Design a protein around this ligand. Structure first.
Ligand code: XZ7
Ligand code: CL
Length: 182
């Protein structure tokens, strides 16, 4: 993934648990070489997987929980690190933001040539409900989408309840989320 992801994890861990913990997570990840992450630089996906696995050990939390928390932190963090305007352009309500996802990724992919964006398909099901189909080149990140949705809820001051209705883990073609909202 691009450095920005890893920076965000470092920053989420650092603010919530201080620096020496970061550094131990870092060493346990096998990442002592690497001095700092470069935001626009492509890294191997394992750097991120190993960061998450190592934070899970050091902090005594499932990787999945850490992933939910990352998903919550990620929109706010990117909005403050140079992507504020861009996220603002993707809309003024949660459902408008969902529908703009693909066009947002098209714009992001101008600046990040090797972006592998996930596929998001949104069905507006009832008035306070949506169904979100999620397909990724990466495995295991459904809990992050959950947290991200919560983050979007907060962004647009909209109450959100999210339930995963289908899991790739059980052998379904893709992750599906039912989303109920304010
Ligand atoms: C709003 C965000 C959207 C984003 O995070 N997109 C995204 C997500 C991933 C996931 C994993 C994956 O499924 O491959 C990696 C972050 C771990 C990889 C590639 C991309 Cl382009 C987004 C956020 C900020 C900005 Cl600045 C632009 C886009 C979402 F996910 F909800 F769509
Ligand atoms: Cl990517």
């Amino acid at each position: 993934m691009y450095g920005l992801v890893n920076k965000a994890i470092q920053d989420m861990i650092s603010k919530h648990h201080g620096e020496d913990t970061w550094e131990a997570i870092k060493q346990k990840a096998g990442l002592e070489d690497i001095d700092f992450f470069v935001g626009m630089e492509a890294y191997s996906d394992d750097v991120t997987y190993h960061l998450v696995g190592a934070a899970s050990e050091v902090l005594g939390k499932p990787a999945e929980e850490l992933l939910i928390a990352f998903g919550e932190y990620w929109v706010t963090y990117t909005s403050e690190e140079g992507y504020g305007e861009l996220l603002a352009s993707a809309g003024d309500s949660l459902p408008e933001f969902m529908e703009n996802l693909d066009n947002l990724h098209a714009r992001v992919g101008l600046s990040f040539p090797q972006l592998r964006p996930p596929a998001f398909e949104c069905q507006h099901t009832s008035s306070k409900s949506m169904e979100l189909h999620y397909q990724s080149t990466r495995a295991g990140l459904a809990p992050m989408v959950l947290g991200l949705l919560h983050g979007l809820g907060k962004r647009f001051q909209t109450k959100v309840e999210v339930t995963q209705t289908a899991f790739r883990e059980t052998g379904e073609d893709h992750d599906i989320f039912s989303i109920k909202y304010e």
